[PDB]
Each structure stands twice: as C-alpha cells, then as structure tokens.
Design a protein around this motif. Sequence first.
Motif, PDB file in Angstrom:
ATOM      1  N   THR A   1       0.852  -1.184   0.000  1.00  0.00           N
ATOM      2  CA  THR A   1       0.000   0.000   0.000  1.00  0.00           C
ATOM      3  C   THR A   1       0.885   1.231   0.000  1.00  0.00           C
ATOM      4  OG1 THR A   1      -0.429   0.876   2.238  1.00  0.00           O
ATOM      5  CG2 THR A   1      -1.126  -1.408   1.751  1.00  0.00           C
ATOM      6  N   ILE A   2       0.439   2.296  -0.658  1.00  0.00           N
ATOM      7  CA  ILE A   2       1.330   3.420  -0.894  1.00  0.00           C
ATOM      8  C   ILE A   2       1.045   4.655  -0.056  1.00  0.00           C
ATOM      9  CG2 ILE A   2       1.510   2.583  -3.260  1.00  0.00           C
ATOM     10  CD1 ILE A   2       0.288   5.378  -4.067  1.00  0.00           C
ATOM     11  N   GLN A   3       2.044   5.523  -0.017  1.00  0.00           N
ATOM     12  CA  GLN A   3       2.002   6.781   0.690  1.00  0.00           C
ATOM     13  C   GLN A   3       1.044   7.731  -0.031  1.00  0.00           C
ATOM     14  OE1 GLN A   3       3.746   6.748   3.503  1.00  0.00           O
ATOM     15  NE2 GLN A   3       3.019   8.823   3.981  1.00  0.00           N
ATOM     16  N   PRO A   4       0.213   8.458   0.723  1.00  0.00           N
ATOM     17  CA  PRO A   4      -0.608   9.470   0.058  1.00  0.00           C
ATOM     18  C   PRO A   4       0.265  10.428  -0.746  1.00  0.00           C
ATOM     19  CG  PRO A   4      -1.416   9.125   2.250  1.00  0.00           C
ATOM     20  CD  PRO A   4      -0.146   8.308   2.143  1.00  0.00           C
ATOM     21  N   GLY A   5      -0.217  10.821  -1.918  1.00  0.00           N
ATOM     22  CA  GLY A   5       0.520  11.695  -2.805  1.00  0.00           C
ATOM     23  C   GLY A   5       0.074  11.452  -4.228  1.00  0.00           C
ATOM     24  N   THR A   6       0.816  12.001  -5.180  1.00  0.00           N
ATOM     25  CA  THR A   6       0.539  11.785  -6.591  1.00  0.00           C
ATOM     26  C   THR A   6       1.793  11.270  -7.274  1.00  0.00           C
ATOM     27  OG1 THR A   6       1.139  14.023  -7.321  1.00  0.00           O
ATOM     28  CG2 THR A   6      -1.118  13.688  -6.571  1.00  0.00           C
ATOM     29  N   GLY A   7       1.641  10.820  -8.508  1.00  0.00           N
ATOM     30  CA  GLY A   7       2.784  10.382  -9.273  1.00  0.00           C
ATOM     31  C   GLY A   7       2.351   9.560 -10.455  1.00  0.00           C
ATOM     32  N   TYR A   8       3.260   8.719 -10.927  1.00  0.00           N
ATOM     33  CA  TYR A   8       2.983   7.892 -12.080  1.00  0.00           C
ATOM     34  C   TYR A   8       3.268   6.439 -11.771  1.00  0.00           C
ATOM     35  CZ  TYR A   8       1.956  11.825 -15.058  1.00  0.00           C
ATOM     36  OH  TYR A   8       1.359  12.921 -15.640  1.00  0.00           O
ATOM     37  N   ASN A   9       2.403   5.574 -12.278  1.00  0.00           N
ATOM     38  CA  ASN A   9       2.558   4.148 -12.102  1.00  0.00           C
ATOM     39  C   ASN A   9       2.102   3.415 -13.343  1.00  0.00           C
ATOM     40  OD1 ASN A   9       0.993   1.406 -10.954  1.00  0.00           O
ATOM     41  ND2 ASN A   9       3.073   1.766 -10.179  1.00  0.00           N
ATOM     42  N   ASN A  10       3.040   2.723 -13.978  1.00  0.00           N
ATOM     43  CA  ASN A  10       2.737   1.930 -15.157  1.00  0.00           C
ATOM     44  C   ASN A  10       2.004   2.729 -16.230  1.00  0.00           C
ATOM     45  OD1 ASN A  10       3.953  -0.480 -14.123  1.00  0.00           O
ATOM     46  ND2 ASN A  10       2.145  -0.760 -12.814  1.00  0.00           N
ATOM     47  N   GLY A  11       2.465   3.957 -16.449  1.00  0.00           N
ATOM     48  CA  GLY A  11       1.950   4.808 -17.509  1.00  0.00           C
ATOM     49  C   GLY A  11       0.930   5.829 -17.036  1.00  0.00           C
ATOM     50  N   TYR A  12       0.232   5.507 -15.953  1.00  0.00           N
ATOM     51  CA  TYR A  12      -0.890   6.321 -15.500  1.00  0.00           C
ATOM     52  C   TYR A  12      -0.566   7.262 -14.349  1.00  0.00           C
ATOM     53  CZ  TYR A  12      -3.596   3.474 -18.630  1.00  0.00           C
ATOM     54  OH  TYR A  12      -4.076   2.849 -19.758  1.00  0.00           O
ATOM     55  N   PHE A  13      -1.104   8.473 -14.433  1.00  0.00           N
ATOM     56  CA  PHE A  13      -1.115   9.371 -13.294  1.00  0.00           C
ATOM     57  C   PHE A  13      -1.967   8.743 -12.211  1.00  0.00           C
ATOM     58  CE2 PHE A  13      -3.158  12.849 -10.895  1.00  0.00           C
ATOM     59  CZ  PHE A  13      -2.031  13.495 -10.429  1.00  0.00           C
ATOM     60  N   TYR A  14      -1.577   8.938 -10.961  1.00  0.00           N
ATOM     61  CA  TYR A  14      -2.434   8.535  -9.860  1.00  0.00           C
ATOM     62  C   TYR A  14      -2.435   9.603  -8.781  1.00  0.00           C
ATOM     63  CZ  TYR A  14       1.546   7.379  -6.881  1.00  0.00           C
ATOM     64  OH  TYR A  14       2.685   7.441  -6.102  1.00  0.00           O
ATOM     65  N   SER A  15      -3.510   9.634  -8.007  1.00  0.00           N
ATOM     66  CA  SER A  15      -3.613  10.531  -6.875  1.00  0.00           C
ATOM     67  C   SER A  15      -4.239   9.738  -5.746  1.00  0.00           C
ATOM     68  CB  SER A  15      -4.463  11.755  -7.219  1.00  0.00           C
ATOM     69  OG  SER A  15      -4.608  12.603  -6.081  1.00  0.00           O
ATOM     70  N   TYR A  16      -3.632   9.807  -4.569  1.00  0.00           N
ATOM     71  CA  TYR A  16      -4.181   9.178  -3.377  1.00  0.00           C
ATOM     72  C   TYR A  16      -4.108  10.182  -2.247  1.00  0.00           C
ATOM     73  CZ  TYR A  16      -4.554   6.190   0.785  1.00  0.00           C
ATOM     74  OH  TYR A  16      -4.917   5.643   1.996  1.00  0.00           O
ATOM     75  N   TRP A  17      -5.267  10.571  -1.736  1.00  0.00           N
ATOM     76  CA  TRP A  17      -5.322  11.536  -0.653  1.00  0.00           C
ATOM     77  C   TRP A  17      -6.197  11.019   0.472  1.00  0.00           C
ATOM     78  CZ3 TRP A  17      -9.710  13.772   1.357  1.00  0.00           C
ATOM     79  CH2 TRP A  17      -9.495  14.766   2.321  1.00  0.00           C
ATOM     80  N   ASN A  18      -5.830  11.317   1.712  1.00  0.00           N
ATOM     81  CA  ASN A  18      -6.742  11.075   2.824  1.00  0.00           C
ATOM     82  C   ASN A  18      -6.568  12.122   3.913  1.00  0.00           C
ATOM     83  OD1 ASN A  18      -4.904  10.093   4.934  1.00  0.00           O
ATOM     84  ND2 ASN A  18      -4.714   8.234   3.691  1.00  0.00           N
ATOM     85  N   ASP A  19      -7.490  12.130   4.868  1.00  0.00           N
ATOM     86  CA  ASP A  19      -7.501  13.160   5.899  1.00  0.00           C
ATOM     87  C   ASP A  19      -6.722  12.734   7.137  1.00  0.00           C
ATOM     88  OD1 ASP A  19      -9.078  11.247   7.002  1.00  0.00           O
ATOM     89  OD2 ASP A  19     -10.887  12.479   7.169  1.00  0.00           O
ATOM     90  N   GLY A  20      -6.049  11.590   7.055  1.00  0.00           N
ATOM     91  CA  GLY A  20      -5.222  11.099   8.146  1.00  0.00           C
ATOM     92  C   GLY A  20      -5.937  10.293   9.216  1.00  0.00           C
ATOM     93  N   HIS A  21      -7.234  10.053   9.039  1.00  0.00           N
ATOM     94  CA  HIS A  21      -8.011   9.348  10.053  1.00  0.00           C
ATOM     95  C   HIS A  21      -7.545   7.911  10.263  1.00  0.00           C
ATOM     96  CE1 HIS A  21     -11.466   8.379  12.588  1.00  0.00           C
ATOM     97  NE2 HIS A  21     -11.629   7.288  11.861  1.00  0.00           N
ATOM     98  N   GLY A  22      -6.954   7.328   9.225  1.00  0.00           N
ATOM     99  CA  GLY A  22      -6.642   5.911   9.211  1.00  0.00           C
ATOM    100  C   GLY A  22      -7.798   5.119   8.631  1.00  0.00           C
ATOM    101  N   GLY A  23      -7.592   3.827   8.414  1.00  0.00           N
ATOM    102  CA  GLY A  23      -8.682   2.967   7.996  1.00  0.00           C
ATOM    103  C   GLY A  23      -8.857   2.834   6.494  1.00  0.00           C
ATOM    104  N   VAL A  24      -7.859   3.238   5.724  1.00  0.00           N
ATOM    105  CA  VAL A  24      -7.923   3.052   4.274  1.00  0.00           C
ATOM    106  C   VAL A  24      -6.541   2.779   3.698  1.00  0.00           C
ATOM    107  CG1 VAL A  24      -8.076   5.581   4.045  1.00  0.00           C
ATOM    108  CG2 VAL A  24      -8.461   4.145   2.036  1.00  0.00           C
ATOM    109  N   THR A  25      -6.468   1.821   2.778  1.00  0.00           N
ATOM    110  CA  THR A  25      -5.232   1.573   2.059  1.00  0.00           C
ATOM    111  C   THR A  25      -5.502   1.662   0.569  1.00  0.00           C
ATOM    112  OG1 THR A  25      -5.598  -0.827   2.158  1.00  0.00           O
ATOM    113  CG2 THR A  25      -4.178   0.147   3.849  1.00  0.00           C
ATOM    114  N   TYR A  26      -4.496   2.109  -0.171  1.00  0.00           N
ATOM    115  CA  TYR A  26      -4.588   2.264  -1.619  1.00  0.00           C
ATOM    116  C   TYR A  26      -3.367   1.593  -2.233  1.00  0.00           C
ATOM    117  CZ  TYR A  26      -4.291   4.450  -6.218  1.00  0.00           C
ATOM    118  OH  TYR A  26      -4.186   4.666  -7.569  1.00  0.00           O
TER     119      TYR A  26
END
Length: 189
Positions: A1-26
């Motif tokens: 599971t990855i760190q919140p942030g943006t970047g590129y993975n296998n050709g695609y842009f991605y964005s993962y954001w959370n409010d820090g509450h916990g309880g979600v993985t991406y």
Amino acid sequence: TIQPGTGYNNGYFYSYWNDGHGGVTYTNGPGGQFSVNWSNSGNFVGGKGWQPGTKNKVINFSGSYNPNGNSYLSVYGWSRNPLIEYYIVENFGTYNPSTGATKLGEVTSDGSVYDIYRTQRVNQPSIIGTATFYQYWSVRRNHRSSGSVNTANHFNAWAQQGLTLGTMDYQIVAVQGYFSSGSASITVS
C-alpha cells in the motif's frame, strides 16, 4: 500500500489523498489497475488516470466496487481558471452526492441518463489551496462498476447549461469515501 501523494505508475497518473483518520489503504497495480480497501475510514480519494486530462477523452473502467457506507465511484477531476471540481458518478454507496442539490438538466451517455447538478464548496481545500469553488456533477441513473465514459458528452452538456470548465488539471477514475468501509479493484484505460 502506498504513501498518500501523486505520481505515475505503469503509464498512469495517480492521486491518493486522505484526511489522516486511518482505515484506508490504496495500492497501485499493473497497467491502469488500482485497489482500495477501507474499514471505518475518514475522508479519502484515490485513483488512476491522466495529468492533464482532456475534454474529449473516452475513459474505460472495469472491475469491482463494494462500498459499505458513504463512497463514490466516478470519473473525477479539476479545471483551473475557473477552478472546478467535477464528477461523472457511475456508482455510489449510501449517499447520492446530488442530494439536495439543484438539478440543471439531463444528459444521455454510454447507456444511461445522467442528472446534472452544480454545488458550491465554501472555503474548502482545493488543488490551489483553500478556496470557494463550484462542483459539477453528472450522476448516472443506472449504477455500474464497468463501462466507458465519453467525457465530451458530459462536458458539452455542462457547457450548454452554463457550467463552464477552464483548463484541465488531473482526470482520474476515483474511489472516494467518507467515513465508511468497502473494497474496490478498478482498471483504467
């Protein structure tokens, strides 16, 4: 599971954001795939796509989406100048995000009628900092977790109704959640 942030993975842009509450993985998978697993999360948004998006992209998505509580599955993105956060909502959980919002028309695209809405966020986080800005919504009547979205049909219908988009920023297929649980596995192209 990855760190919140943006970047590129296998050709695609991605964005993962959370409010820090916990309880979600991406997690990012091969090609356009990403997975989201959540259990009593806070607010989060994660998905794959493009930076920048375009106004005539045909976006394909496929997989599984199993929310338990408040969550959306959408084509999701922003424009700048004007600053707009927008959604073409293909499925959702316990909450229809257009609840109480003023309806600004209908558009038929990709096998369903969608209802169109505008809402306003007041002094809320955005891609440019805290701001007041409009959100545009197309909400699909016929829910699904695979399909194809002809974004031009939505952007054109929005423009027709006076909902103007500026220059595109990112454009992703996103799972959004607000204090809920669920799982999703989605492949974008």
